[PDB]
Design a binder for these strands. Sequence first.
RNA 1: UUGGCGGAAAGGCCUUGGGUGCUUGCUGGCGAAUUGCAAUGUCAUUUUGCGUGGGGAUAAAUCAUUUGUAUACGACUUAGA
RNA 2: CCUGAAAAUGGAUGGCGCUCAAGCGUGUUACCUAUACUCUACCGUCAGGGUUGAUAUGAUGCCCUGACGAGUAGGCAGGCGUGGAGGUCAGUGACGAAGCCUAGACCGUAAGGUCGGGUCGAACGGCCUCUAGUGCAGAUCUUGGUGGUAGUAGCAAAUAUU
RNA 3: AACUGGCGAUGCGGGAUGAACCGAACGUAGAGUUAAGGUGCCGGAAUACACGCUCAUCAGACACCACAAAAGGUGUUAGUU
RNA 4: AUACUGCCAGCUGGGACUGAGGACUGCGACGUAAGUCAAGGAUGCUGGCAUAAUGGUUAUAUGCCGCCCGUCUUGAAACAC
RNA 5: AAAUUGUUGAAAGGGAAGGGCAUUUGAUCAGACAUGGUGUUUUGUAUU
Lengths: 106, 167, 197, 127, 122, 111
Amino acid sequence: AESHRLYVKGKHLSYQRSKRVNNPNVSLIKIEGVATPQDAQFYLGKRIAYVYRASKEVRGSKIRVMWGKVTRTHGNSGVVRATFRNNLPAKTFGASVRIFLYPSNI
Amino acid sequence: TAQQAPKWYPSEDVAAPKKTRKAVRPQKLRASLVPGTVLILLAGRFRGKRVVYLKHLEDNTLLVTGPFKVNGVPLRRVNARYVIATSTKVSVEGVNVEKFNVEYFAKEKLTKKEKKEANEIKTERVEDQKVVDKALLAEIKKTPLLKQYLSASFSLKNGDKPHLLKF
Amino acid sequence: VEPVVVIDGKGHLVGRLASVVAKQLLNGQKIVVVRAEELNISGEFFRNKLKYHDFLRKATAFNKTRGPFHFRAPSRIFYKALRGMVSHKTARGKAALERLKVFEGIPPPYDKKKRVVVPQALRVLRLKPGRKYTTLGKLSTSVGWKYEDVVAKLEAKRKVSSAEYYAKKRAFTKKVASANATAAESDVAKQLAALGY
Amino acid sequence: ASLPHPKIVKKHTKKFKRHHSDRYHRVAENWRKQKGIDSVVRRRFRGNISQPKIGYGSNKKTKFLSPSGHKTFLVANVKDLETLTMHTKTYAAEIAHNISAKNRVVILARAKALGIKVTNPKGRLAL
Amino acid sequence: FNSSIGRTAQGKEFGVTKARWPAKSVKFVQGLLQNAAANAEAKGLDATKLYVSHIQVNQAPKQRRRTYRAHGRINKYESSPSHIELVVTEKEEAVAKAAEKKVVRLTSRQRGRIAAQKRIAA
Amino acid sequence: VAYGYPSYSTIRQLVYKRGFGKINKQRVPLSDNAIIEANLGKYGILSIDDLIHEIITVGPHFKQANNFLWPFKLSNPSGGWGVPRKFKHFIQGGSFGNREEFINKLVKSMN
RNA sequence: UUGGCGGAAAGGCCUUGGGUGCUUGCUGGCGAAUUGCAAUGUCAUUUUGCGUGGGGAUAAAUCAUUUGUAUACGACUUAGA
RNA sequence: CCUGAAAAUGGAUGGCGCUCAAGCGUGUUACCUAUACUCUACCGUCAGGGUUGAUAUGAUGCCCUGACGAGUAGGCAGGCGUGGAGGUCAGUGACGAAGCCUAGACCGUAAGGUCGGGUCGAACGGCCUCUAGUGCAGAUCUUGGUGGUAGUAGCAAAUAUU
RNA sequence: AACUGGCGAUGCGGGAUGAACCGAACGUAGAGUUAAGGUGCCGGAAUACACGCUCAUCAGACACCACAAAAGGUGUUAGUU
RNA sequence: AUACUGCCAGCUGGGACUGAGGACUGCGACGUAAGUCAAGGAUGCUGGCAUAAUGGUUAUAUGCCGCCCGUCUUGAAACAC
RNA sequence: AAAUUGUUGAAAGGGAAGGGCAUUUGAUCAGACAUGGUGUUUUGUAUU
């Protein structure tokens, strides 16, 4: 009906980091409804897309995308580690991400 | 000038590769999907739509149908990693499927000059749709609500957790 | 992940609540906190009164108008607790703080809306029974907050209007239960029971 | 045409600028090593510029190659093109800056005739 | 060049507090403005749409004097002359129009979408 | 150091996974029975298992067989060290010293 | 459209009447396809034009002059068709 | 745990705050991340070796193998650049040399080299060598030029101008 | 003064911060593990699990290290006679 | 006939990074006899796009980090020159 | 030439500025399926 979601709601939390050094090449991602590492294993390897808008239409779109994958889990609380084709800009900490259901195993 | 001819020279001929030891073995498909299984497409034009799985093709690609009469998805081929297999199974006995292959979906790619500056279906393909769909519809009617099941596109709803969601 | 989460601070510990909210704001969750005056701090009132007097001592010696600004309102004390848990001097910290609103009582846009609680920060779940605790409203008044009596009258008003809606809500719900009792013994309801509903 | 050549993205494509060449006009940007006793750059403190080091050196079978995969040879006259005749897939000609426009047309004609790629076959004319 | 000059209410119209009345500068600019207006008149220009489209003051070579300081010392007492130039043009209409055509590049799936939208729409 | 008494299983795994011979002062991977036979064949050690056998059951030619092996280059343990602080004795809840048989768990997770 | 309610930041809530669609409550007919095995595959505003047209009531401040309850200058308090 | 327990700007378990703790003692795990360890690629260095094979590949050429890489004072090596000299390119050039400007390009880890564009007007480069008054950020360096200060300090003794 | 290890000559992770402490010494990159140190929020990581103890009208909170003592308290807990 | 320990050259899954390297060779595995193979380093198939789309440069923003260089000195960002 | 200055124009700016890694956004740019199945179906056929 009015709902058309096929991906899972996710938050870009931060780069992988120590206390004072961060690694932009890896992003920490929250998955909605995942609070334990065991539930995060389902999403390992799944495609992720940060979807954003730009004022300049580039190739017939004003919506631009950066793609990535969930590479592994992070911590004890369901956060996952993610790498993107281009690293996320870091102004998107707390921004929304889309975790898709492909590549699928169920 | 610096030099009339460099003291060292590169190779003229293109190097040939040596024999690669990579044989192409057949794909091992996952057990959840067998011919007759109702799938859910995750990407493409028909993302979220429910199509039944019909045949495993030669290029590691699933062959599926809506049926087209039910939801507008023609006899098509999908990537196995872009579908979700469900426990709902309709018997695939009764519909002939041996005539479909990679040659069946031969494309005749466009040319470079052909370009959309401003901005059909073969009779055999549609006739094949009318044969497969009538044979598969005939079995769909045995399970009540299944024809209505196949028409409704799948979507995730607020609170639906795919890692816990059984299909 | 809701567009806005509205928490009532009644019976909540200021520090633990400030910790939870600060994490939510950083992760992109807009939060508003109401009933800031009914928030709780662990320790007797004298303890927490002395601590704010210690905070009151600290001021720039050569010009008091540039030193720490000692906000007395219970909402601002919670805001101070939270801002200490946010990297507020960075642009990312300003954005997280913007996503937060704190109020005393419940202003009009939120007394028609849902209020949630944080079990991590609830006083009746966290503090060992018998342990003395401070209510934020009394503490703020003692250090110069002026609007405890105003809020009490406006909270009494909102509650009594909120009581009528619930009694109306009970009126509307009982008509479903008695009408469903007559629309009961239906095959649809039986079928849903066998199918988990 | 070929394999997907090495040097995919980066080893160090950034210029090694001299320390404090952004601070004073008198300090040119040509790389100089800091020799000071207390220099944060010499001592390699975190957050400071990187110093040139032999580890940045490029792959030997790709070193000196243009993006096209050809090495660039400076050529002052047609005779300088003879060395490039039989290596049109590994070398490319660059016409020297001080060649006249009339003689630049001749070198371009010969390089095109023997299929020699020129790195700057558009100087002294407009498109 | 307004450091430690006085304040006035006659700078209010420009949103400033600091303003002055540089008579010698004004007279020199007036003589240049008149020269430019006379130049336009000999150029056939309208001479009622003319506006100051370019004006710029840079430093002419210093005229050097000397001033005597305490304890037998000499310092410079320098003029800072001006090179002034200006251009007066008459105001015109819109310069141009017809922005970029922007030859569009779509993928195969983008073309299929708009074709599907176009038939869906009317 | 941490040390102890390795079993046959961990020695086999050490040599198979991380086994390099010192040949002409060079660290060449074993990877073949010929490489050991060409360097330890005068002592009768002809296969990788012949080399493992001379290690597990300390043989007359242990010194030549053991010195032929390049020092094993292990990783950090896959699941960690099991203790918060390494630099106490194993007996004291640390990590160094003689852990008799528990070297097998530590080494296998390091190998 | 008719009645109300809501000042804590109300700016939103309930409404009685009509019309107007939809309705998957149940049963049908037709369509979809080639976006080619995925590509966010594009579905929710601020502001602008000698924009479109349906309305709407046609002001002040500042300089300068003036004042001394004010004043270094600004600022202020006054007056002035 | 409390008393004992007093110092000067306001103030520091790093801060917030924390009270069956987010305190203290202890046990058990899980998890986080260094330029460290393992593995892989690429650079260099060093070491140990192979190679006189066809009507294509100077043997300080080509190639194989392993290990290693912090660095002040300092030593050495290989190179980059400048003025002049011998030889050569029967080199570039008034159809534009040298010089200069250019968030243009390419190459080199780098010193720097090459080139596009602009300006310009008489000389100047590559390579093999020779040679030196040969490389600047500093020396309260030298000479010269120029800033911020700043339209600032100020331009008020000697009665006085209209 | 002795022995050793260091800093000087040395970056890097940790001790907020610091020449010397802890960890580890450095070619350029990638992946995986770790060290020391941590995992309420700042801040990556359990508002984890388990047993106790403590309420301070100056609690305490982590080596080097940025201090506290003698002497006392039917405050509280355990233990000995 | 079991929450423990050890072993298996036991089995069945789910993720990630890497693809270095020959004009012709080695060690092996698999059927009882055309030879194949996962055995001295990636191939096969399929898309989209031949352009600033990828990328280089540069400006800004964002996250985290970054004291002023030279010098003497055990020790310099130094309230040392 | 540079310092220094008027300053196409662009951009940034809540008690300095400048720098490093990374991406994003803007601006800007180099490199590419142009002659090699037919020894050549068109195309100023030895210009492929």
